[PDB]
């Protein structure tokens, strides 16, 4: 695993020693090379795992997330190239350093053979993201947003640490292999109930769960484009990865401890999908759509069936890609309008046809159009929930309909209609933006050819 960690570390001295007008080229090229190297991890095996050493190991749940994390950085660099043009060389190097540190922390988090190291890196990811949100944020609310994005997370995970060490005082180890092989049931007791709560609430808050999601619209709206990319695409999947890793010791208590969370997620998907219908902001709409998709993933994880896990993994990957592309499109519109309001900019297919095509494809992918991996995860989770209970489909069905609605609404209000007359600063889309859109959308349609690469270890 060091063959990928070491180049990510070496990205920092290369950036800090580069010329004042050549940092972006070097960063993008070497990030793409690192992603190409990390593509090797996709060759998983039906056997146990790729146990590299005592500290790092790779599974078919960790491999797609690692590949997505490595692939995200070049896209974030291309997205941030624009609004950091008038920025001093030292501050641009600091921004690239923060991005590289975040990628390194995520890469070390996704392997994380030991659970305490996983938690330490899980919380280490919080610092560069907070710095990015609070420093390079345009609006005045960013600071408050950052505060939220911090405290919620910590409020979730401070008990977890205690629980973690408590386990090592009883079980004696926190290595995931030993934990899996020496698993023992949790008796129905109040102490076990609170241990379950401490283990679960840590990852519930960052997913986020409905009722604990108030930090997410603030963090995504107030953050710069790269921050929105990293939060929507990868940083949301940390909770799901942690839950799928840690639910191996919570049985059979979960069989009755998942009812409040299942109810909360199955109603919050509807609530957030309806919230998306009436939104005056594009970024808030995308954030609430992300909340709905993550609530569906939470339902899948709480069901705890093989089809649930497969659908959860596929949906996480597809949602990360789709949300990243949607945030990029919204930022491209904002950089010309400088308002971030849906109804101010209208009739854009007359002026930017290729951007309208990109918007259509992104909306269709969000709308879960077959045979995309989005719908693969959707159908897997839906069938698993139907097996769990034949009534859930009703709620699920409603969500699907509502989803499509707001998606096309986002497509119709911004692209269709008559253009705004008093906006004459709509320049033709650059090659950079179109290349970013293509690099976002082509991997989705290529992954739909080989779904088993993102279906997880239970395929």
């Amino acid at each position: 695993m060091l063959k990928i960690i070491i180049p990510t570390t070496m990205l920092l001295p290369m950036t800090w020693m580069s010329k004042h007008n050549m940092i972006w080229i070097n960063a993008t090229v070497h990030s793409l090379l690192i992603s190409l190297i990390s593509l090797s991890l996709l060759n998983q095996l039906g056997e146990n795992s790729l146990n590299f050493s005592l500290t790092f190991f790779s599974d078919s749940l960790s491999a797609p997330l690692l590949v997505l994390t490595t692939w995200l950085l070049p896209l974030m660099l291309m997205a941030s190239q624009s609004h950091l043009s008038k920025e001093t060389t030292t501050r641009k190097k600091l921004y690239i350093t923060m991005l590289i540190l975040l990628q390194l922390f995520l890469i070390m988090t996704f392997t994380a053979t030991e659970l305490i190291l996983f938690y330490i890196l899980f919380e280490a990811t919080l610092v560069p993201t907070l710095i990015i949100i609070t420093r390079w944020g345009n609006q005045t609310e960013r600071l408050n947003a950052g505060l939220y994005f911090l405290f919620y997370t910590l409020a979730g995970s401070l008990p977890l640490l205690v629980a973690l060490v408590y386990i090592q005082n009883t079980t004696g180890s926190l290595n995931f292999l030993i934990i899996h092989y020496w698993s023992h049931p949790l008796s129905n007791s109040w102490s076990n109930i609170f241990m379950w709560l401490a283990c679960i609430m840590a990852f519930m808050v960052k997913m986020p769960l409905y009722g604990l999601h108030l930090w997410l619209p603030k963090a995504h709206v107030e953050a710069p484009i790269a921050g929105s990319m990293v939060l929507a695409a990868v940083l949301l999947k940390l909770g799901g990865y942690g839950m799928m890793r840690i639910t191996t010791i919570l049985n059979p208590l979960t069989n009755y401890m998942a009812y409040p969370f299942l109810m909360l997620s199955m109603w919050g998907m509807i609530m957030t999908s309806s919230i998306c219908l009436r939104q005056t902001d594009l970024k808030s709409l995308i954030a609430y759509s992300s909340v709905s998709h993550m609530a569906l993933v939470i339902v899948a994880i709480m069901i705890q069936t093989p089809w649930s896990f497969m659908g959860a993994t596929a949906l996480m990957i597809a949602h990360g890609l789709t949300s990243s592309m949607l945030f990029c499109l919204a930022n491209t519109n904002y950089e010309r309008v400088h308002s971030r309001t849906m109804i101010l900019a209208r009739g854009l297919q007359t002026l930017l046809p290729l951007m309208a095509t990109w918007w259509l494809v992104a909306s269709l992918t969000n709308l879960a159009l077959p045979p995309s991996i989005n719908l693969i995860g959707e159908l897997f989770i839906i069938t698993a929930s139907f097996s769990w209970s034949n009534i859930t489909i009703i709620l699920m069905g409603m969500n699907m309909m509502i989803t499509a609605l707001y998606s096309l609404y986002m497509l119709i209000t911004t692209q269709r209609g008559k253009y705004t007359h008093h906006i004459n600063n709509i320049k033709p889309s650059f090659t950079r933006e179109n290349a970013l859109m293509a690099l976002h959308i082509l991997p989705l349609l290529l992954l739909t050819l080989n779904p088993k690469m993102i279906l997880g270890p239970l395929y």
Partner: protein, 56 residues
Amino acid sequence: NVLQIVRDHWVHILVPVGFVFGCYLDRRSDEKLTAFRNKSLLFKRELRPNEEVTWK
């Protein structure tokens, strides 16, 4: 021009070299765990006449 591009393009080799370094490090890590090489109850094999270790 020699001795001038090196002053400007020495950073380009920084990422690739580290990569191979990591590979070397991976091999070093592998040696420590050879405590069960050819001792597995599933892959227990008699060595070839010109073979010393099953894997490296």
